[PDB]
Design a protein around this ligand. Structure first.
Ligand SMILES: *[C@@H]1O[C@H](CO)[C@@H](O)[C@H](O)[C@H]1NC(C)=O
Ligand SMILES: *[C@@H]1O[C@H](CO)[C@@H](O)[C@H](O)[C@H]1NC(C)=O
Ligand SMILES: *[C@@H]1O[C@H](CO)[C@@H](O)[C@H](O)[C@H]1NC(C)=O
Lengths: 99, 50
């Protein structure tokens, strides 16, 4: 969530030093209106651009009115990738980032 | 791009990525079966590997 009222872009990377494969998990939040977007993330239009040697994936959120499941209408789509040894996964997001 | 049986728009996904063959930018290629007497209409203002 933004600190103060500011959400800087999340420039993060991780080299899989472990010669053993690595399952890196993250997700994207889908708020139920732009008010919930602004309440959590000051940037209205946001993205999640992840990238590895064998991945290229930009994920915009999907704001839509939705039915309440577990007493919560907003959704959260989770993703996964097998990070090979000596391969870096570079996260680059300005909102909705379930890091 | 568009044909009789195709409809796709493709924004480029800019993202920081690992180097492969000394270059970290990617290039996703596509293919389509263009039937006889059928036109494929390309319409891009960028990133078009024609
Ligand atoms: C934090 O929020 C207040 C709100 O009045 C603002 O004045 C201030 O400049 C902000 N900056 C930080 C990081 O404290
Ligand atoms: C770190 O990741 C890069 C790809 O981003 C890879 O080329 C390199 O071999 C990895 N390991 C080291 C020790 O640099
Ligand atoms: C050229 O393609 C169109 C569809 O885009 C088709 O209707 C037409 O018959 C094709 N060629 C000609 C000159 O007949």
């Amino acid at each position: 969530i933004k600190k103060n009222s500011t959400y800087p872009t999340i420039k993060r990377s991780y080299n899989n030093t472990n010669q053993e494969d690595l399952l890196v998990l993250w997700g994207i939040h889908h708020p139920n209106d732009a008010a919930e977007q602004t309440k959590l993330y000051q940037n209205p239009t946001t993205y999640i651009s992840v990238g590895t040697s064998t991945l290229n994936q930009r994920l915009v959120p999907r704001i839509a009115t939705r039915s309440k499941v577990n007493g919560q209408s907003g959704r959260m789509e989770f993703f996964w990738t097998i990070l090979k040894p000596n391969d870096a996964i570079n996260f680059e997001s300005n909102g909705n980032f379930i890091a």
